[PDB]
Curated annotation (Swiss-Prot):
Enzyme Commission code(s) on record: 2.7.1.140, 2.7.1.151, 2.7.1.153
Listed name of the protein: Inositol polyphosphate multikinase
Described purpose of this protein according to its UniProt entry: Inositol phosphate kinase with a broad substrate specificity. Phosphorylates inositol 1,4,5-trisphosphate (Ins(1,4,5)P3) first to inositol 1,3,4,5-tetrakisphosphate and then to inositol 1,3,4,5,6-pentakisphosphate (Ins(1,3,4,5,6)P5). Phosphorylates inositol 1,3,4,6-tetrakisphosphate (Ins(1,3,4,6)P4). Phosphorylates inositol 1,4,5,6-tetrakisphosphate (Ins(1,4,5,6)P4). Phosphorylates glycero-3-phospho-1D-myo-inositol 4,5-bisphosphate to glycero-3-phospho-1D-myo-inositol 3,4,5-trisphosphate.
Portion of the full sequence shown: 65 to 416 of 416
Top EC group: transferase
Residues annotated as transmembrane: none
Compartments (UniProt record): Nucleus
Molecular function terms from GO: 1-phosphatidylinositol-4,5-bisphosphate 3-kinase activity; ATP binding; flavonoid binding; inositol tetrakisphosphate kinase activity; inositol-1,3,4,5-tetrakisphosphate 6-kinase activity; inositol-1,3,4,6-tetrakisphosphate 5-kinase activity; inositol-1,4,5,6-tetrakisphosphate 3-kinase activity; inositol-1,4,5-trisphosphate 3-kinase activity
Residues annotated for ATP binding in this entry: 11, 67-69, 80, 206
One GO location term (cellular component): nucleoplasm
Taxonomic source organism: Homo sapiens
Record note on what altering residue 99 to R does: Decreased activity with inositol 1,4,5-trisphosphate. No effect on phosphorylation of inositol 1,3,4,5-tetrakisphosphate
Effect of residue 209 to A: Loss of enzyme activity
Result of changing residue 96 to A: Strongly decreased enzyme activity
């Protein structure tokens, strides 16, 4: 992810088949002649899409030009949460499934995984960062506190941002409960709140494993429901 001062990010296509798949996902969703109500509604929850981009002198080098969801914030606190019970897709080999489940074997049970967070701390004028090992360390016993950490500015728990996050996740959940045409594997929610009131972003990102489907995305729904439940309990802290 490359942050451009113009309020966009450039995401380099991942190697095939992942990068091509994410390009086609955005292309399908933001298709100029799309009148599909499901896809039109979904746009609200994605980064705005500015199409494929490549450097003027390097047509080989493929990027997606996307809205920087953090741009409107002064001191954005950012958390990326992978959603779902399975982070492998319907066409994964046995080896690939094993690889994916071993990365975080609690995915089925919890239905989400914190990929990272960056939290602004007021009293130190500084950022705490947590990497992928943080979330992969969390268990059923420690997931609530693990998530809570995102909402601590070093003096209060930001229950405003927690409540706002629930409210925005609920809208995404409502979208999922009103579509049976896409299933999303190893995709994420990006949470952003203002670390310097109740202003928040929650957006869907990372679409290298989105597939056509005939069914509700039950794993994604489970993940959202559990994440909402965890956030709800944090409101009682
Ligand atoms: C943990 C916490 C925060 C971190 O920093 C940032 C900063 C900005 C973004 C960020 O802001 N708008 C985005 C649109 C699409 C994506 C994206 N799409 N696919 N993979 N990433 C990331 C975006 C994402 C992450 C990095 C790690």
């Amino acid at each position: 992810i490359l942050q451009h001062p113009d309020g966009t990010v450039l995401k380099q296509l991942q190697p095939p088949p992942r990068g091509p798949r994410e390009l086609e996902f955005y292309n399908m969703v933001y298709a100029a002649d799309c009148f599909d109500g499901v896809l039109l509604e979904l746009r609200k929850y994605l980064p705005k899409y500015y199409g494929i981009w490549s450097p003027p002198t390097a047509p080989n080098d493929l990027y997606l030009k996307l809205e920087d969801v953090t741009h409107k914030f002064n001191k954005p606190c950012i958390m990326d949460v992978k959603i779902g019970q399975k982070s492998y897709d319907p066409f994964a080999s046995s080896e690939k499934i094993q690889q994916q489940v071993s990365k975080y074997p609690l995915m089925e049970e919890i239905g989400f995984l914190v990929l990272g967070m960056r939290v602004y701390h007021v009293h130190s004028d500084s950022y705490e960062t947590e990497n992928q090992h943080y979330g992969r360390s969390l268990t059923k016993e420690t997931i609530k506190d693990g998530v809570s950490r995102f909402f601590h500015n070093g003096y209060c728990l930001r229950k405003d941002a927690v409540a706002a996050s629930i409210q925005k996740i609920e809208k995404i959940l409502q979208w999922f409960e009103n579509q049976k045409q896409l299933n999303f594997y190893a995709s994420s929610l990006l949470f952003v709140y203002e670390g310097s009131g109740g202003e928040v972003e929650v957006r869907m990102i990372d679409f290298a494993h989105v597939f056509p489907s005939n069914t509700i995305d039950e794993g994604y729904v489970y993940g959202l429901k559990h994440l909402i439940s965890v956030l709800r309990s944090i409101l009682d802290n």
